């Protein structure tokens, strides 16, 4: 056939480029970083109404100060999360401190290109890693299967990403409140989702310095959806 | 490098079938028919040797029926050499169990172990599967008399009567027609031979083209006897049942 | 480096054929004729010494090989493959039997071990099957005299008499007419020489024929005296002169 | 066909096409030479000046093995370096066990067997270099040249790379006109000339000359680079001959 | 058609890579010959130095494997030296383990078994060489044993290898048909070398100078190669009768 | 060792080996899971192409992983045994180290993790098996029903079906299962499970297996006659 | 650990095991249950080196429970004891052996017979009517030799066991803080809560 | 074509296509410039962003107090190679109490890259590196290609549109080599060099990345408002 | 028998002030009754405003300080030149020391 670690004539790794296509098929995930916190939100996308949607876990805690949202082949993310959690805890064991969000992201991204003929293929999942540390404050990173990570003020991944990213381009400013960011994620998710957005097919979360990483209750998110509907009807 | 020459023996087709397993089963369909029939008072194993010669030493020959221990025997359909590899593994597993628990291995536990080995060759290692189907005839004190089959996929199932190898479709129809639950060994002997006699690709069914075995509680009192039939004894049972 | 051929080179084709085994059998078909006949008081194995050049000393090339003192082997097909199998067969007779039980293996079990080696070349990674069919003759106390054929697949069958290689189909027909259960060893040797003459084109004598027997114990070939229970090897290779003597009464 | 897609495959001719393709990489490289003199050997190489930004005298190509062997090569420079690293390991283990520094014929076979080993399997690629090497041992001077196949022979003079035909013709004249032999200092001068003459095949870009030598009288049997006044003298001698 | 790239059976029961390794054998365009005397074994081979820049002393296809065993190779020099180094290692190991010098026929068998492995295992290629081993064995006397890429080997009364092997073979065959003996009935090795050179000249139809030949001689307890001047003396004797 | 990457991405971002493993699941006999208010029922299809079978000894379709959790499947039977064995070992390993039996979610997560691993390990093909894992957590009376598939994704279901013609029985369940009021009793839950299989099965004879799991390690398999009574009652109501 | 006794009567097996856990100077606990249920009708009491005892007992328990789930079948007491013996016989030639002695009391539901097996840390197995480990046998066996009958009831077995425990409490130097007694019969395993 | 499936295969003209394709990944990467005088050595790197919300990908990595590089191509491969350089620099300090020579650092990178070009299963590195350093023989600049070829230079550039900066340096050679004891003027020459490779975009405060090492200057990286002085 | 440990003597003293800290140590190095050196520095600046001394067996002491200094260097590389706080250094040293739990560094460390 052909090598798994083969370069194309353009200078790209075939397998990495193909895994990026799998991520485009995945459900939408959005992150927005503010000075009051980082917000993470996902589309759940249940395949059937009999599927109990609260068992869909696409937003995950890595440590108290670091959360993570995923998009693509979500089964692939389990070993990445496990590594991230282990790295976060291990660093605390060795250094009696929280690990920097960038250092955690870098550790996860070191796994990405360990494939060949090690694992047999790249990961088919992209991650939004959000967190806080004392040195660089509130941060949002986008971790790919290429091993590259970019920091973002705001970022969307998955099937509605380019439409969402264009929307985040206009809406993000450096003075956004946490409440404003929550509504903004809900607004953009509602825009790109096939089904109508509610508390059972979408999920919110945030990371603040005071309270750490929290996945929002369906009751809490439901109120923020109702608040969104009213403020859009207000003009 | 080496990838160029790799057949990739452990992959799914677009339809979700295992190529090599399917093709191994195709191989097995050209092997001599083996039949197992389970009765209330015993089990019969009958099997057809493939187009023999007059110069083949039959009394010292074994290609179909093998002893795994004193309570369990197998009938083979497929590559004989492949079967002997698995048979020796099974014989060891039975003795490992006996050494550990000081009790003879239950029939299903032996069958599952061999079947799991076959399964491994379909999922990992990049090697061709074993081109063998087994009929297991055995007795233990939990389930009594048992018949099983396993094939190159590593899937196994239990049976009252079953065939493997050539003309299984025709053979299974004939067994399904004449089998009854209250049947006895002497009746089952007759059914097995009658079924082979009709399904055989040979002109006539003779003693020199058969291997035959019974597992009976026809052993003096509360015990089980395996009888691998001799050439003369197969000749006698062919006259008794009225085939020659 | 490293052997990166960890996958099977013999696989099932859509029709259920193992191509490499069939092709190995084809290589056996091209090989020189060898045969075996079992008598009441012995076994004979024979083949043609097809000399590649007249400058070659064909006595140095042994087609018939002693495996144990009571077991011998001959082949048809690829000679080098045969030579390494004989080395492995001799060794396995010791490692898996004599070093355990203090005696040489019975014919059927040594055959079983050789068969296993040939089967593994049919399934293991990065190897082709052996391109030979063996005929193994031997004696042991509880089974008596026996003759076995072993094919590239690893399958083996016992025979009263048989032939393999070039003119096997004609030779097996010839043997069917002549073989009975009352043959003495000398009668089997006579039949072996008659059968082998049909498949040989050129010279037919003790120097172009290799023939060995499994027969009576040869105390003269033991190499020592003093132990009554050790009576010597039953395997004996016939000399060039001994063959020619039986070609006058032919 | 398909016999050229994999290393260690005999074609129907009895040829290993992958080795023959490695030779094409060698032929594409810069010209390098070797001259066996009376009590030693001289190595020289053409270094193409791709740009003014290359620091003069810095990108050294000739490599020492142990203290008495010089190696120069044409083709894929990294492959040459890999071969020399192995050569250094072989020369070290030889000296460790046997005390004496590795003889040149002994060293030649160590490289030879290693290069040949890379024509035995499809899991490795043949070496994309021809290597000219040698030095002084207990039995005197020795010059060798080693091809991608693992083939090597002893030489009076050797040349490889893009300007090898030109160089070979010049070397053949020296052999004919000096049956009694050539001195080490003569061989340095002649080496400079031959590289300058062989530079006609690479005439587009200008080049930098690099010479080294082992001689029993001139360097005490140790490998040294030709530097300063002796290098300039050889450059002047070379420049005079082309005009 | 990947049955032609690796050592697996073709539908005809053939190994094409083995057959093609036999063709690589004649790539050097060199012919060798070996014969047995009463007390010696002589091997001769053509020497061709096409380049004037070559050091002719280093151009050789004859190898001193052990003190007693010599080996001439027909095939490319890298594979020749691969086989040489291995044979040397095997011969040395044999002596260490078993306490006596490795016999010529046993070494031939060992190298043949190694060659066989390359015809069965896919990752290893055959070596494109034919190895002719010579000695005066302490048990069997003068010995010639030859190995090829198929893993075949056999003893010889005399033998020839190369592009023009058949011409040399038939020439030798005819001589032994006359004499009706398995060797050259001659006391001195010097005259057995003279026989070998004479019959190569007759078979090939070419004359030889001292630099056109390469000679190896096996006697009891040593194998040695002749210098150009030792060969010259041999050529002078041939011309003078 | 054999290291070959069998599960790899294609230009359109698909891993075909994983997708072809799902096609093996599609071929497998139908399996269904329905959770009531205080129970979970696992129903399984038995193809009647095989008669002369010995049903005493033939491998049953529903397997106990521990005393409180069961596993059924659709796809390759031989593959399922490897997952069941690993799951059973992990269940005992969990009891040994945590001093508490596995939750149904934990056991599911483990099995799903094994399945995922076989989609990005060298030299191995994915499992041609989807599972339904059902039971009750220790000292908990809330029913649990999960599903896994070859890719290694898993999720919780009020009711679910897998295998051949699972599209049809899922259609049935989606209209007949109410979340606000699940099958309040064992009877209602078994009835709805038998009804769902009768959309696909053929004869209601020896072709339907039913296993009821209740809280506190109360697991029982229904017999032929007990199931036959459900089959009889369903069609007599249908004749109207 | 210290005293472990076993007695097989007509229709049951009774295992008595001390409650004391002593770490050198002090008695850390006086209610310790030195037993594990291997299957519904098989109980194993144990005594030996600290840590190894519980580690071994739980390891065996896990393995038998695994077998029970895999086969949907309870192994016979004979089969369980043979498994346990092999584990100890394997252990004795290890880098660091399990220093554990066990009694296995089980009711065989097939034969309808109680069975008591005594296995020491070397892997020395014997089936007995009554058994002990350590110094317990030295005091108790003379009483059991006298009073034991194969047709004894469970109540008679408990009374004979009380006499054994009384003799131990009189003549043993160590205070073992009484015993926990458990009965294994056709109905399974139960603890006698007043002894 | 038929000879680009893996790195173990020469083409009929003696080319290694997988290596050449790895070389192509460098040409897609963002421009970076290297230059030196006799006292100091400078790296200038144009950082690339994904979009306006994203950060600008870091291009310069420190390897020791006296050595570091800039990258162009696959950033994870640069991390692997720079980590290897950090280890080798560190081994030299710990074992020999010796700062690793820049020339020797080049040789080690060459040999590491080479092994990936001659063995089956692996792949070449997909990144080009510009290594600067100050050691016992003064200032140095190296250019690493994943073919294995390492070259010592006065100045150079790699990445997209690098040819413009490379020509400028080739003209300015005689001027910038003489900028001794003036770090700011040497950086100015590097910033002016990298400007010859810009199109449409210009050097902003979060776009530009500069690094310097010299006689009494540890390897230090300047980003953000620290480079506004040179815009 | 070979004894891998030795005693190089010496004494060290650390005192924490309100907004400062001192770590002092004598400069004498000894074996048995002999003086090896009258000035062999024992207290080291390890970077990040941390001072360290590992007193006892000087070979193990020098090894530990060397490894901790190295740990500081790699902390900078791996965590964006972040300053290693004294508490984090202390935990890191615990792991260095405990890594050799069954062949200990024969030193009493103060930072
Ligand atoms: Cl050998
Ligand atoms: Mg091969």
Author numbering:
A (entry chain D): 1 to 117, 125 to 242
B (entry chain B): 1 to 244
C (entry chain A): 1 to 250
D (entry chain F): 2 to 244
E (entry chain G): 2 to 242
F (entry chain C): 1 to 240
G (entry chain J): 1 to 195
H (entry chain E): 3 to 233
The authors write:
The eukaryotic 20S proteasome core particle (CP), a barrel‐shaped multicatalytic protease, represents the catalytic core of the UPS. The CP is composed of two identical outer α‐rings and two identical inner β‐rings with total 28 subunits that are arranged in α1‐7β1‐7β1‐7α1‐7 form. Three catalytic subunits β1, β2 and β5 present in each of the inner rings confer distinct caspase‐like (CL), trypsin‐like (TL) and chymotrypsin‐like (ChTL) proteolytic activities, respectively, with the active site threonine at their N‐termini. Given the vital role in many cellular processes, the inhibition of the CP constitutes a promising target for the treatment of diverse diseases.
Subclass II is a collection of novel cinnamic acid and cinnamalacetic acid containing GLNPs exclusively found in the promoter exchange mutant. Thus, the main compounds 3–5, which possess the complete 12‐membered ring structures but contain different aliphatic tails, were investigated for their inhibitory potential against the ChTL activity of yeast CP. As expected, compounds 3–5 showed strong inhibitory activity with IC50 values of 27, 73 and 107 nM, respectively, which are weaker than that of 1 (19 nM) and 2 (4 nM). As shown, compounds 3–5 do not bind to the CL active site at β1, because the structural conformation of GLNPs displace the peptide backbone of the ligand from the proper alignment with the active site cleft. However, the electron density maps reveal that 3−5 covalently bind to the β2 and β5 active site Thr‐1Oγ and develop hydrogen bonding interactions with the oxyanion hole Gly47 N (residue numbers are allocated on the basis of the alignment to the β‐subunit of Thermoplasma acidophilum). These prearrangements facilitate the Michael‐type 1,4‐reaction of the Thr‐1Oγ to the double bond of the GLNPs, located at C4 in the 12‐membered ring system. In contrast, GLNPs have the highest binding affinity to the ChTL active site at β5. In addition, the P1‐alanine side chain forms strong hydrophobic interactions with β5‐Met45 and the P3‐threonine moiety is hydrogen bonded to Asp114 and Ser118 of the adjacent β6 subunit. While all these interactions are uniform in each of the bound GLNPs, differences between 3−5 are found in their individual aliphatic tails. As expected, the yCP:5 structure shows that the phenyl moiety of the shortest ligand does not form prominent interactions with the protein side chains, which is in agreement with its low binding affinity, resulting in its 27‐fold higher IC50 value compared to 2.
